[PDB]
DNA sequence: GGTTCTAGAACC
DNA sequence: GGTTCTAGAACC
């Protein structure tokens, strides 16, 4: 049976009514978290049993999956945290069919 | 010459302009983090060089310092986060003298 | 030294 | 398995 985990994530991403706060990205190979706090406090608790970002991330990096990093290139911009991107191989727009080889680390 | 991050931290919670954030503990052996969210985007970018709660914790750690764990002893109280509170022996209230004894762990 | 990303371990 | 707290390592 899939972990509740990955299929919370799928439900929370796939869901047209929290693209406020995460959604695929444009080529649906990562997923985007656009509004850290609200994400955090409005939708985790809906979904798990904490509002903590960190704890999101523990279980994130726990099932494999990496930040996709984004470097300042140009001008600081201070007044915008650089959205959060996560990516997995098998975590995929259109393929829930490739969810089934994502792995727990132990 | 004392880590500026020890010199930010004292400063900030000693400073009474920024107490609904971050202040002494009632018996001032600790210090809390009332409002995390408005702290971390609020406060922190004016003292270091980011918004992120996990990265001035992480500093916490560094340097020695442990969270008070806030247990649910009765009613859970999901409406409230339980402020956030950390501890060193050397980091207290009225005894800047001490400060010189926290040291970074590497 | 400071910041970010990820993971080990304890606790639940 | 999930959540929390802390730390190792890479990057700055």
């Known amino acids: 049976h899939m972990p509740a985990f990955l299929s919370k994530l799928w439900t929370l991403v796939e869901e047209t009514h929290t693209?406020?706060?995460i959604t695929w990205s444009q080529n649906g190979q990562s997923?985007?978290?656009?509004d850290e706090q609200r994400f955090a406090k409005e939708?985790?608790?809906?979904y798990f049993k904490h509002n903590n970002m960190a704890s999101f991330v523990r279980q994130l990096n726990m099932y494999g999956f990496r930040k996709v990093?984004?470097?300042?290139?140009?001008?600081?911009?201070?007044?915008?945290?650089?959205?959060?991107?996560?990516?997995?191989?098998y975590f995929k727009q259109g393929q829930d069919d490739l969810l089934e080889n994502i792995?727990?680390?132990v």
Chains 1, 2 share one sequence.
């Open 103 to 105: 792995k727990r680390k």
């Open 31 to 34: 997923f985007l978290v656009l």
């Open 69 to 89: 990093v984004h470097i300042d290139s140009g001008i600081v911009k201070q007044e915008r945290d650089g959205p959060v991107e996560f990516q997995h191989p």
């Open 43 to 46: 939708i985790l608790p809906k």
């Open 19 to 21: 693209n406020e706060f």
